[PDB]
Design an enzyme around this catalytic site. Structure first.
Site, PDB file in Angstrom:
ATOM      1  N   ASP A 232       0.847  -1.184   0.000  1.00  0.00           N
ATOM      2  CA  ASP A 232       0.000   0.000   0.000  1.00  0.00           C
ATOM      3  C   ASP A 232       0.892   1.246   0.000  1.00  0.00           C
ATOM      4  OD1 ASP A 232      -2.017  -1.869   0.501  1.00  0.00           O
ATOM      5  OD2 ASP A 232      -2.512  -1.091   2.491  1.00  0.00           O
ATOM      6  N   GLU A 503     -14.277  -1.183   5.150  1.00  0.00           N
ATOM      7  CA  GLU A 503     -14.583  -1.173   3.728  1.00  0.00           C
ATOM      8  C   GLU A 503     -16.008  -1.663   3.504  1.00  0.00           C
ATOM      9  OE1 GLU A 503      -9.953  -2.019   2.382  1.00  0.00           O
ATOM     10  OE2 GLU A 503     -11.298  -3.639   3.030  1.00  0.00           O
ATOM     11  N   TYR A 615      -9.172  -9.387  -1.728  1.00  0.00           N
ATOM     12  CA  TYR A 615     -10.122  -8.401  -2.214  1.00  0.00           C
ATOM     13  C   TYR A 615     -10.753  -8.887  -3.514  1.00  0.00           C
ATOM     14  CZ  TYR A 615      -8.642  -4.694   1.065  1.00  0.00           C
ATOM     15  OH  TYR A 615      -8.360  -3.938   2.188  1.00  0.00           O
TER      16      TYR A 615
END
Ligand SMILES: O=S(=O)(O)[C@]1(CNC2CCCCC2)C[C@@H](O)[C@@H](O)C1
Length: 658
Positions: A232, A503, A615
């Site tokens: 990230d 999320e 994800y």
């Protein structure tokens, strides 16, 4: 050439199969290629598919093996005790197990190349490792080799690494076949690639997939094109897009939706060893976590993403500064000039850089690309490139000039080192994207940007309302626009969580009723409901029946257009595991019209419970199939960083799920 050996329909049932007589006299020269089509839907924890060994007492470390693990890792060992060579090469998350209720035929190609001194492994048309060595060990020249084995390695006359699975075809060639030749070997893949290493993005890594079905029937995907390994931000990351006009069968060459040019777009092999794997590009601006929606009013496609200034990511972003000065209900981007220790400037109307301490305009302006102009003329900075040539990560100027951007390390004027949200639009359904604009701050002058929830925004069925979910400490913050993204307001919904990565993804259950599913720290997916098109939100409930880890994983969610079992249906995509990011499932829930409750009736396993799934993106294709674009690896594990071509796309039908 022709294979020196070729056989098939081998059942590996925890019992070695000797193929010595068919193979050993044929092995010739120092270069070999092994091609293996095999299935393993119930593998042992560690098992050899193919072995070449010296089987004599005293020579147990003289062998070659192709092995796998029940994690989906593939590898080879190349060992010769008399040469003092012991090579082990592998990569996690390289295999498929099952698809649509059937074992997958994996296609493995291993090239042992004496002239280039390189060992290269491909699985399912993907190069998973390529290792060059100083002292090459031909697999045919291991001292005293006398056994060729399937489903085990023979060491000192005994079976090691017994395998469960089957080898449908295996071929051996006395040549290192070229990459070109490898690409001609027919595959039996259950998936395809949309974004991939060596494409137009020149990123070697991808994360955070999205999918969205446009009104024209075009299916659009966005992604983080990650340059500095899979890390990230802080890093170099761009947002890339691709679309399909044939229900996901073929995809366009990717383009960028948001990009920065302070660092070169480099295809870099990021180190995976335990000394260097945390190496992180530390002076680059980046974008991270994208989300897409289509607007009915304008017809535009709208994409949002987080924006990170040079060297900034979640961990070091100033949490107590929005980056904007509010003046009578207007927000102006603050700037710090080089040499100053404070932010003495703002960007005003028409891009005029205003000195706050003298209340006069400067000769500097900012254009729509957030680039700095002096007296109307473009300032530049020198671009950086990265390398590991010295044995550690080095970031250095490369002699190329690019426009000076306020998000860059080298800029004369710099924005607050915190996170922002930006938006871009496309007027041609993803064939090109506009220059990004920053969203206003929603939580006051003393609060960093909220964090965009990756995936889909939500366009309401009976109005022109657009909603994008975001999260921050203590709440979900829905960003709402009723004018094609020209203006935004927030709707806050408290959540029983401090600092969670919450999320969230939304579905419209029926007109004006939105259910939001979101990641938590409890090991369960949570949800809340709005019954006024996002204005207000209910208390939080939890789904019993799906497991996540303590840290959680993004969940994607859609409302299916067709009835299933005569009921309206929601489909969730998520790992279903208390342990890691693995055991991916689609979960089909039917809505009880009584109270809008959902009965989670069907669970479909994307692949083996032990294979990676992180994800994900799901969308109903215009033909009523389901497309899934997902991270096929454990994106939390510190053992699975920096893997290429693990974001993969599959097509499913409802009958597969039920
Ligand atoms: O109903 S929408 O919100 O416009 C959307 C698309 N619906 C069509 C309906 C017709 C079949 C294909 C999917 C669902 C979301 O998941 C996005 O893909 C956009």
């Amino acid at each position: 050439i022709s294979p020196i050996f070729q056989g098939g329909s081998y059942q590996l049932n925890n019992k070695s199969i000797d193929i010595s007589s068919l193979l050993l006299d044929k092995l010739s020269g120092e270069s070999q290629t092994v091609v293996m089509k095999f299935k393993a839907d119930k593998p042992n924890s560690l098992q050899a598919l193919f072995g070449l060994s010296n089987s004599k007492a005293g020579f147990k470390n003289n062998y070659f093996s192709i092995f796998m693990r029940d994690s989906g890792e593939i590898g080879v060992e190349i060992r010769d005790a008399q040469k003092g060579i012991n090579y082990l090469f592998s990569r996690p998350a390289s295999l498929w197990g099952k698809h649509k209720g059937q074992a997958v035929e994996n296609t493995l190609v291993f090239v042992s190349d004496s002239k280039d001194k390189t060992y290269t492994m491909y699985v399912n048309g993907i190069e998973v490792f390529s290792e060059t060595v100083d002292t090459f060990l031909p697999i045919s020249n291991i001292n005293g080799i006398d056994k060729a084995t399937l489903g085990a390695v023979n060491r000192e006359g005994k079976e090691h690494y017994l395998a469960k699975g089957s080898i449908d075809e295996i071929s051996l060639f006395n040549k290192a076949i070229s990459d070109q030749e490898v690409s001609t070997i027919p595959l039996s893949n259950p998936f395809q690639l949309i974004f991939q290493s060596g494409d137009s993005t020149q990123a070697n890594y991808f994360r955070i997939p999205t999918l969205y079905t446009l009104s024209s029937g075009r299916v659009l995907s966005s992604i983080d094109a990650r340059y500095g390994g899979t890390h990230d931000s802080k890093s170099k990351i761009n947002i890339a897009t691709s679309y399909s006009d044939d229900n996901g069968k073929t995809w366009s060459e990717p383009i960028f939706a948001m990009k920065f040019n302070d660092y070169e777009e480099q295809l870099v092999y990021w180190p995976r060893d335990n000394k260097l794997k945390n190496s992180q590009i530390s002076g680059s601006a980046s974008f991270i976590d994208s989300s897409i929606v289509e607007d009915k009013k304008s017809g535009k496609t709208i994409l949002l993403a987080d924006v990170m200034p040079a060297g900034i990511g979640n961990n070091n972003a100033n949490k107590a500064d929005s980056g904007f000065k509010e003046i009578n209900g207007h927000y102006y981007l603050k700037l710090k000039k080089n040499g100053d220790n404070d932010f003495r400037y703002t960007v005003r109307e028409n891009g005029v850089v205003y000195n706050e301490t003298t209340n006069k305009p400067t000769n500097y302006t900012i254009n729509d690309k957030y680039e700095v102009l002096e007296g109307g003329k473009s300032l530049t900075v020198e671009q950086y490139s990265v390398d590991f040539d010295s044995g550690s990560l080095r970031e250095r100027h490369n002699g190329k000039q690019v426009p000076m951007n306020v998000f860059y390390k080298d800029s004369l004027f710099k924005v607050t080192p915190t996170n922002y949200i930006a938006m871009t639009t496309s007027q041609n359904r993803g064939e090109s994207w506009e220059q990004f604009k920053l969203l206003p701050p929603f939580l006051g002058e003393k609060h960093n940007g909220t964090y965009l929830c990756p995936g889909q925004g939500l366009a309401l069925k009976s109005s022109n309302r657009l909603i994008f979910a975001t999260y921050t400490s203590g709440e979900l913050t829905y960003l709402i626009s009723d004018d094609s993204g020209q203006t935004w307001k927030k709707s806050s919904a408290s959540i029983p969580f401090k600092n969670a990565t919450a999320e969230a993804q939304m579905v419209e259950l029926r007109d004006g009723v939105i259910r939001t599913f979101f990641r938590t720290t409890t090991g369960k997916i949570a949800y809340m409901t709005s019954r006024d098109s996002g204005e207000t939100w209910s208390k939080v409930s939890y789904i019993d029946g799906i497991q996540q880890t303590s840290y959680g994983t993004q969940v994607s969610a859609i409302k299916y257009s067709q009835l299933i079992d005569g009921k309206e249906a929601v489909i969730l995509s998520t790992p279903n595991s208390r342990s890691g990011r693995k055991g991916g499932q689609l979960v089909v829930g039917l809505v009880n019209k009584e109270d809008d409750s959902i009965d989670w009736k069907y669970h479909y396993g994307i692949d083996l419970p032990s294979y990676g799934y992180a994800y994900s993106a799901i969308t109903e294709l215009p033909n009523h199939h389901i497309g899934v674009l997902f991270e096929k690896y454990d994106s939390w594990s510190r053992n699975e960083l920096h893997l290429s071509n693990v974001v993969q796309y599959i097509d499913l039908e409802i009958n597969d799920l039920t």
